């Protein structure tokens, strides 16, 4: 979870993603609120189909004391799945998202008991 990796599927060709990567990364930064304490990093880009591309990201957050660390994957996924944020993501061409952290049974039970 500490590695903070979120996989995103885009309904865009790989060449289009790479061709405008600066813009894509900044738009993701804007979705996060645009503060200078958050930085979006691209871990990888992979074609999945003619017009489907997976983009793996993480977000580095800086503390008031200058320390930096990655936003945990579960925390970042939780933000992106919020209805308002998901809609903004869909406007960028995102059609899905996944975190790598395998949740514990108690975490899963909590999510089922409180799906919202």
């Amino acid at each position, epitope marked *: 979870d500490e590695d903070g990796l979120i*996989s995103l599927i885009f309904n865009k060709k790989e060449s289009d993603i790479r061709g405008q990567q600066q813009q894509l990364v900044e738009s993701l930064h804007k979705v996060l609120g645009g503060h200078q304490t958050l930085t979006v990093n691209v871990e990888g880009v992979k074609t999945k189909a003619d017009n489907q591309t997976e983009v793996i990201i993480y977000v580095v957050e800086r503390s008031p004391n200058g320390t930096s660390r990655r936003v945990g994957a579960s925390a970042l996924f939780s933000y992106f799945e919020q209805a308002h944020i*998901k809609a903004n993501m869909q406007s960028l061409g995102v*059609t*899905g998202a996944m975190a790598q952290t*395998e*949740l514990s*049974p108690v975490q*899963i039970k909590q*999510l089922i008991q409180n*799906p919202l």
Partner: nanobody
Amino acid sequence: VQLQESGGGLVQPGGSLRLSCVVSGDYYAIGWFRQAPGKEREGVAAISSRDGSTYYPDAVKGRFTISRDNAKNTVYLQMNSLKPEDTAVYYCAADRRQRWGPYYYLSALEYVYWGQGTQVTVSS
């Protein structure tokens, strides 16, 4: 989490089959995946434990339905109007990673827990 399927068989075109899988352990996502001879595993149905949303590829829409009886810890795949192109080994699989969208619900790559599979053959 452990999975064991049942319900496969030899089916005539237009016929029905109902698969079952008994599940032990908690999961975020569970689905059915099929693999025809020499081909890749493809997702045919998935469900979210969090909100009960379901996902299907167009090729089985209206014909396949995934459901659960949580009392029995069992998930089902009801398959109607079967066609020879549906012939395959069918697997139940589960995973504990969060996701949204059909791609990650239906991609076999994104499930870590696999059943043993049950054969489904559709022929006249």
